[PDB]
Motif scaffolding. Sequence first.
Motif, PDB file in Angstrom:
ATOM      1  N   UNK A  19       0.652  -1.396   0.004  1.00 17.66           N
ATOM      2  CA  UNK A  19      -0.016   0.017   0.122  1.00 17.66           C
ATOM      3  C   UNK A  19       0.930   1.359   0.101  1.00 17.66           C
ATOM      4  N   UNK A  20       0.158   2.301  -0.494  1.00 22.26           N
ATOM      5  CA  UNK A  20       0.927   3.713  -0.359  1.00 22.26           C
ATOM      6  C   UNK A  20       1.027   4.503   0.988  1.00 22.26           C
ATOM      7  N   UNK A  21      -0.020   4.111   1.673  1.00 18.91           N
ATOM      8  CA  UNK A  21       0.110   4.878   3.119  1.00 18.91           C
ATOM      9  C   UNK A  21       0.043   3.682   4.156  1.00 18.91           C
ATOM     10  N   UNK A  22       0.457   4.136   5.457  1.00 14.34           N
ATOM     11  CA  UNK A  22       0.216   3.265   6.846  1.00 14.34           C
ATOM     12  C   UNK A  22      -1.359   3.015   6.957  1.00 14.34           C
ATOM     13  N   UNK A  23      -2.103   3.856   6.721  1.00 13.93           N
ATOM     14  CA  UNK A  23      -3.844   3.839   6.964  1.00 13.93           C
ATOM     15  C   UNK A  23      -4.338   3.003   5.894  1.00 13.93           C
ATOM     16  N   UNK A  24      -3.667   2.903   4.519  1.00 15.39           N
ATOM     17  CA  UNK A  24      -4.398   1.870   3.532  1.00 15.39           C
ATOM     18  C   UNK A  24      -4.321   0.665   3.860  1.00 15.39           C
ATOM     19  N   UNK A  25      -2.895   0.139   4.415  1.00 14.78           N
ATOM     20  CA  UNK A  25      -2.323  -1.083   4.661  1.00 14.78           C
ATOM     21  C   UNK A  25      -3.073  -1.376   6.191  1.00 14.78           C
ATOM     22  N   UNK A  26      -3.448  -0.650   7.254  1.00 15.61           N
ATOM     23  CA  UNK A  26      -3.825  -0.729   8.617  1.00 15.61           C
ATOM     24  C   UNK A  26      -5.389  -1.132   8.581  1.00 15.61           C
ATOM     25  N   UNK A  27      -6.072  -0.543   7.689  1.00 17.09           N
ATOM     26  CA  UNK A  27      -7.343  -0.909   7.444  1.00 17.09           C
ATOM     27  C   UNK A  27      -7.614  -2.297   6.567  1.00 17.09           C
ATOM     28  N   UNK A  28      -6.557  -2.413   5.926  1.00 15.40           N
ATOM     29  CA  UNK A  28      -6.607  -3.989   5.078  1.00 15.40           C
ATOM     30  C   UNK A  28      -6.448  -5.186   6.262  1.00 15.40           C
ATOM     31  N   UNK A  29      -5.417  -5.004   7.207  1.00 10.09           N
ATOM     32  CA  UNK A  29      -5.448  -5.639   8.104  1.00 10.09           C
ATOM     33  C   UNK A  29      -6.617  -6.361   9.070  1.00 10.09           C
ATOM     34  N   UNK A  30      -7.856  -5.590   8.999  1.00 10.89           N
ATOM     35  CA  UNK A  30      -9.298  -5.902   9.475  1.00 10.89           C
ATOM     36  C   UNK A  30      -9.732  -7.060   8.921  1.00 10.89           C
ATOM     37  N   UNK A  31      -9.245  -7.218   7.461  1.00  3.29           N
ATOM     38  CA  UNK A  31      -9.913  -8.514   6.647  1.00  3.29           C
ATOM     39  C   UNK A  31      -9.472  -9.831   6.986  1.00  3.29           C
ATOM     40  N   UNK A  32      -8.140  -9.599   7.745  1.00  5.50           N
ATOM     41  CA  UNK A  32      -7.520 -10.970   8.587  1.00  5.50           C
ATOM     42  C   UNK A  32      -8.125 -11.053  10.269  1.00  5.50           C
TER      43      UNK A  32
END
Length: 36
Positions: A19-32
């Motif tokens: 991801x481009x931002x820490x935010x974009x990756x951090x909200x993706x961790x919710x799928x796991x």
Amino acid sequence: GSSGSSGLLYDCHICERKFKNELDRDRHMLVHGDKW
Ligand SMILES: [Zn+2]
């Protein structure tokens, strides 16, 4: 030898998507994190 002018900065430790931002990756961790 060559390299790009830009790139993805943040990475998932479950599925290796990036991801481009820490935010974009951090909200993706919710799928796991849904597998509680
Ligand atoms: Zn992931």
